[PDB]
Amino acid sequence: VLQKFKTKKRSTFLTLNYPRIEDALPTLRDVTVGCDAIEVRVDYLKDPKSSNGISSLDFVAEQISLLRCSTTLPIIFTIRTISQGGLFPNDKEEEAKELMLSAMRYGCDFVDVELGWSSETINILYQHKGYTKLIMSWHDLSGTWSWARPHEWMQKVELASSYADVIKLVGMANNLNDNLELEEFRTRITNSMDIPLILFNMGRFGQLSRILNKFMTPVTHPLLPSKAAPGQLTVKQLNEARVLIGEILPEKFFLFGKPIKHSRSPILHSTAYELLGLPHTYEAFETDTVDEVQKVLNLPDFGGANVTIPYKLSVMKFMDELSDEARFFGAVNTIIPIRIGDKLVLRGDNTDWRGIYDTFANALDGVSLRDTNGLVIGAGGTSRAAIYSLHRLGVSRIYLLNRTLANSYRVQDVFPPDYNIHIIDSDNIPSEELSSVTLSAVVSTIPADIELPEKVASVIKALLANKADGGVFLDMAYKPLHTPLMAVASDLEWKCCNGLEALVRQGLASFHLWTGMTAPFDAVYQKVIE
């Protein structure tokens, strides 16, 4: 989790500072865009039952879990005190310690531990850390601790190094020169030590240093009630700034295939750049052979490319590496360039399955699919991704339905014997086993412009009746937009998703693999459908 962040070029995290996590939930998917983690500023939370001024353990815990049910992002648990720029009283160390211990007990990924707390308390928190990583932090609100002559900073590093998984040092900038002295300091300390370091100056004058701090920079978003500290930037602003100073360079992205004339992938990715402050372009590049794409892959400014029909298999030729999924499904839709130095390495990945997986992940709310029953309909390439996706989400019985047994068997035999696949024969229908089968997830991968034979439709109708609360139906076709089966399902009260949603989320996964950043589904979807 930290190792992920360390080998990543640039990480950021959101300073979530609502008074209640309930207030965050409606727009949470928009405000976390581009972030690798979420800091819950515990000092900003307001407990309705308090009367001593401190959030109770029960409350803070209800809040933290409420958030964990709405996002998979790692969490940073931060109690920031008054003299470090937050709201938590400095005199109340025992109450802070109690809170931080609790956070480690329910598996927060990180805890911010201020170097103003007693060494007794710091040690006790260190002794109980478990898997939680400690961020040892100090903030110089005075702006008097020089980075060029850093006696007081080095005392703090000394104290922190006994305990730290990460060290966070934040100055207050009086002028440009303070940001420059800070970079000198960054170079010197980083040579002499290998605990990872968050390092910048707050203040409007400090903004350069935030931009240059690559590892775990805090960011905010316009919908949050306030900045956590002076000079703080949004993700959009942060990228915009990094582009303007020459840190992030413009990159050309592409779509290979034929016909691609009418692909809406360029609008999808164009929109994503615009919402994240990135300077990239994305272009359809239709070719008659696959071999004509090789000169594109070698452009000095090539940032990646999607691959659609008929080149998902024939392009694999040019890859040096494959992701597990690309190898397993024997197909590439996402080409990722990696400059290890002056060597180009091309990595093929496949996000087609992510269209399925990520759609369910978002459509489910609280509902976990661990130990539930699913149904996949169809036997093409997409059905295989659907089976993998349902399995990966924890479905313990994956029902598989087709016109013929041989079709279902071909698909089944890709996976091992204990992959929870249970084939249904539409001829010899085992009605009594199926009567008691309550489904939580369904995926149709078959064509929508053809009405089915009424011996298969009959079975689909019957199974869809038996439905778990919050159960989700997904149709992978978008032609028509509202399909025959979707109607059947919707009348039976299923939460329904369409193939355009999945297509959009495939693209977004590709975008994340390229830029290191997520993009918001809603606004990107609104421009694709236009």
Can you spell out the DSSP letters for 40-85?
A: EEGGG---SS-SSSS--HHHHHHHHHHHHTT--S-EEEE--BGGGT
Shared domain check, 517 and 397? no
Are 190 and 331 members of one domain?
A: no
Say whether both 81 and 164 belong to one domain. yes
The token pair at 468 is 């778990």
Beta-strand relationship, 344-349 and 334-339: antiparallel
Buried b (16+ CB within 10 A) or exposed e, 188-201: ebeeeeeebbbbbb
- For 465, the domain range is 352-497
For residues 71 and 23, state if they share a domain.
yes
Q: What is the DSSP letter of 88?
A: B
Resolution (A): 2.7
CA distances (Å), origin 413, targets 126, 302, 354? 50, 38, 22
Whether residues 94 and 219 share a domain: the answer is yes
- Collapsing DSSP states into helix, strand and coil, what is residue 496? strand
Are 237 and 258 found together in one domain?
no
Looking at 215, 232, 248, which one is the last position of a domain?
Answer: 248
Same domain as 374, residue 282: no
**Distance separating alpha carbons of residues 393 and 387, to the nearest angstrom:** 10
φ, ψ of residue 319 to 5 degrees: the values are -90, 140
Domain limit, last residue, from 218, 233, 248: 248
Rg over CA atoms, the chain: 26
CATH of the domain at 503: 3.40.50.10860
Coil, strand or helix at 255: strand
Which residues, 6+ apart, have CB-to-CB distance to 187 below 8 Å?
none
Give the HSE-up count for residue 257: Cα atoms under 13 Å, Cβ half-sphere: 21
The experimental method, as deposited, was X-ray
Q: How far apart are CA 337 and CA 250, in angstroms?
A: 14
Q: CA of 231: how far to CAs of 83, 171, 190, 525, in Å?
A: 18, 12, 24, 32
> Residue 221 in contact with residue 238, Cβ under 8 Å?
no
Which residues are the active-site residues? Answer: 139, 168
Helices (H), 217-318: 235-244, 265-276, 294-297
Closest CA to 214 of 249, 251, 248: 248
CB within 8 Å of 342: residues ≥ 6 apart: none
318 and 395 assigned to the same domain = no
* Residue located via tokens 């039976």: 492
Determine the longest span between alpha carbons in the chain, in angstroms.
83
Question: Last residue of a domain, which of 195, 213, 248?
Answer: 248
> 284 with 316: CB under 8 angstroms?
no
215, 275: one domain: no
Residues 6+ apart with CB under 8 A from 60: 42, 45, 47, 99, 102, 103
In terms of Cα–Cα distance, which of 272, 227, 230 is closest to 251? 272
On the 0-12 / 13-18 / 19+ scale of CB atoms within 10 A, 423 is middle
Co-location of 112 and 222 in the same domain: yes
* DSSP SS3 for 415: coil
Which residue in 438, 449, 437 sits closest to 499, CA to CA?
A: 449
Whether residue 341 is found in the same domain as residue 358: no
H-only helix segments in 198-297: 207-212, 235-244, 265-276, 294-297
Distance of CA 384 to the CA centre of its chain: 24
Cβ atoms of 348 and 321 closer than 8 Å? yes
* Cβ contacts of 432 within 8 Å, gap of 6 or more: none
Question: Which structure tokens are listed for 395?
Answer: 């479905």
Handedness of CA 482, 485, 487, 489 (dihedral sign): negative
Q: Are 144 and 120 in contact (CB under 8 A)?
A: no
Q: Domain total for the chain? A: 3
Structure tokens at 446: 């078959």
Alpha-carbon span 323 to 142, nearest angstrom: 49
- The CA-atom distances, in angstroms, between 412 and each of 215, 377, 400 are 44, 13, 9
Report which secondary-structure segment, H or E, holds 485: helix 484-491
Residues 255 and 244 in one domain: no
Tokens 């960011």 label which residue?
219
Give kind and range of the element (H or E) at residue 150.
none
| Pairing between β-strand 439-444 and β-strand 75-78 as defined by DSSP bridges | unpaired
Q: What is the number of other CB atoms lying within 10 angstroms of the CB of residue 142?
A: 10
